[PDB]
């Protein structure tokens, strides 16, 4: 199961037109979240977005978002030390995907991005 | 591999006595790190340890340990809000394990705990 085929199916389930040329890093906008999909490392489908973090959130609160859960697609909050900004991402094997695999991954990623903006109050 | 079979092979490699009855959560002490191994969710082998972080590390420094890399066994640093302590963990599918898969996962987890310094 290649990246090309994976993206195709995903775009077919998003009511999106199958791109004639599938770039290495694909961008899909879900609401206000620009999500990027790519193969990294080879054999793994990685999805990531750049969230907005409340400057008033402590490290403990941010790290609490990364505790393991029963959903292996729950995204991880990290820092692009170099880029100087947060990176939220998830990941799964390209060889064990199901019809709804990629959609759920993208959905769990956005859901995680929304939770991060739900914390100030 | 069933959870029991994976644990048995790992313990043989670590030369550790295998309990008569294998519990769902299994611990192993490596150096100064107590590591816990369990199947969660079903079909996934989860390992985690409770590290001691450097109080000098800022928010950005701690979260930088979580960026994705080429090694899918690189551990994730998180926090248990109730216990009030950090939790470092990694995970991989039970259905795609090899002879040294769990040993490598444990090695990567401890290596990560050491990098937190």
From Swiss-Prot, chain A:
CDD domains documented for this protein: T3SC_IA_SycE_SpcS-like
Keywords annotated in UniProt: Activator, Plasmid, Transcription, Transcription regulation, Virulence
Descriptive protein name: YopE regulator
Pfam families for this protein: CesT
Gene3D superfamilies found in the cross-reference section: 3.30.1460.10
Biological source species: Yersinia pestis
Record's keyword annotation contains Plastid: no
A GO biological-process term: protein secretion by the type III secretion system
Disulfide bonding pattern of the chain: none
Function in brief: Positive regulator of YopE.
Classification via InterPro entries: T3SS_chp_SycE (IPR005416), Tir_chaperone (IPR010261)
């Amino acid at each position: 199961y290649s990246f090309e085929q994976a993206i195709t199916q995903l775009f077919q389930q998003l009511s999106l037109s199958i791109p004639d040329t599938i770039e290495p890093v694909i961008g899909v906008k879900v609401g206000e979240f620009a999500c990027h999909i790519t193969e990294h490392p080879v054999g793994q489908i990685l999805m990531f977005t750049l969230p907005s973090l409340d400057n008033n959130d402590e490290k403990e609160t941010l790290l609490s978002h990364n505790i393991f859960s029963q959903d292996i697609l729950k995204p991880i909050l990290s820092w692009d030390e170099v880029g100087g900004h947060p990176v939220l991402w998830n990941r799964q094997p390209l060889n064990s995907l199901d019809n709804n695999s990629l959609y759920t991954q993208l959905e769990m990623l956005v859901q995680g991005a929304e939770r991060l903006q739900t914390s100030s109050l």
